[PDB]
Amino acid sequence: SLTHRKFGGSGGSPFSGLSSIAVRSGSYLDAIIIDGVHHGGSGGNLSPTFTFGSGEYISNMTIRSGDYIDNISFETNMGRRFGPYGGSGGSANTLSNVKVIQINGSAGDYLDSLDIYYEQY
Amino acid sequence: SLTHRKFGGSGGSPFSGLSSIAVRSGSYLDAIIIDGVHHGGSGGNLSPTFTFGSGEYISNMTIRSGDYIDNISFETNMGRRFGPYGGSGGSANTLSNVKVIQINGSAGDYLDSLDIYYEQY
Ligand SMILES: OC[C@H]1O[C@H](O[C@H]2[C@H](O)[C@@H](O)[C@H](O)O[C@@H]2CO)[C@H](O)[C@@H](O)[C@@H]1O
Ligand SMILES: OC[C@H]1O[C@H](O[C@H]2[C@H](O)[C@@H](O)[C@H](O)O[C@@H]2CO)[C@H](O)[C@@H](O)[C@@H]1O
């Protein structure tokens, strides 16, 4: 059962473990790069890195996928945009009015799949 | 209390976003370093970095806390432990028979709070 629990006090500035994202892309997502950790292969070209602010999170996202992840775009709650990066294959699926918590997946020479954990609002 | 969705195909090798953890600690946790990214202050002493292996996840965790995070220790499904790090203040809470998915929190000069996202078995 998926859940969360908070320990500690009320001080400080919020942070997420998911602190930055970049991709390598061409026709597909060759790689997704999460906090600088690379998942996938070395093809395509490297995107800029998106670094989240305190309290900033992915609120909406569009993922195109087939056998692999074709394309990623997202928007944050601060209205900032990442992508689209990738190609035009697959079909699109969207998350709307969410808070993304984690990005897991599977990768080889490319990014095969994503398993996105999020809160739905 | 949260959900997940999968996108893409069945190829490649699985990965988890949460792949390394270190802390700075004294009396409290001054900081937590997740996938290399520093959250918190510059006090205390830097712990070794725990780098997760293939198929490894936190299955047991004990956090002491009050206004801040006083102490952390955890064990993985593969029997590999981190800590205890920190002090003996606050009060203790344990999660067990879990799979930790993400660590968020809040931090200033110290680690004020941790929000642990997990599957509960
Ligand atoms: O993102 C995957 C690759 O995209 C491009 O590769 C294309 C290539 O441009 C095209 O001639 C060929 O027919 O298809 C491949 C993809 O299957 C990039 O040039 C590569 O760097 C990427 O790996
Ligand atoms: O998500 C990537 C692409 O997945 C499918 O393409 C497969 C195709 O099904 C298979 O016959 C061929 O051998 O491999 C390609 C991927 O290289 C979708 O049909 C495409 O729309 C996607 O771009």
Ligand SMILES: OC[C@H]1O[C@H](O[C@H]2[C@H](O)[C@@H](O)[C@H](O)O[C@@H]2CO)[C@H](O)[C@@H](O)[C@@H]1O
């Ligand atoms: O991420 C896409 C696939 O990557 C790998 O497949 C490679 C294979 O390792 C290599 O020997 C061959 O030359 O190219 C293929 C990619 O076409 C993984 O082994 C697959 O599981 C992934 O789907």
Ligand SMILES: OC[C@H]1O[C@H](O[C@H]2[C@H](O)[C@@H](O)[C@H](O)O[C@@H]2CO)[C@H](O)[C@@H](O)[C@@H]1O
């Ligand atoms: O982990 C927080 C800090 O713990 C110690 O600081 C102590 C200090 O040793 C003691 O003299 C004072 O009375 O209390 C503070 C904590 O409130 C470490 O020495 C520091 O490096 C840490 O930042």
Ligand SMILES: OC[C@H]1O[C@H](O[C@H]2[C@H](O)[C@@H](O)[C@H](O)O[C@@H]2CO)[C@H](O)[C@@H](O)[C@@H]1O
């Ligand atoms: O988690 C850190 C400590 O939090 C509390 O101590 C606070 C106390 O609540 C506050 O009134 C005072 O001003 O600061 C101290 C921190 O030194 C818990 O009572 C302690 O057990 C915790 O160690």
Ligand SMILES: OC[C@H]1O[C@H](O[C@H]2[C@H](O)[C@@H](O)[C@H](O)O[C@@H]2CO)[C@H](O)[C@@H](O)[C@@H]1O
């Ligand atoms: O993480 C503990 C707190 O760190 C900062 O608090 C500072 C504050 O900025 C400074 O003016 C004062 O002198 O010291 C405290 C540390 O106790 C954050 O601003 C707080 O939100 C955190 O709780």
Ligand SMILES: [Mg+2]
């Ligand atoms: Mg408490």
Ligand SMILES: [Mg+2]
């Ligand atoms: Mg400050």
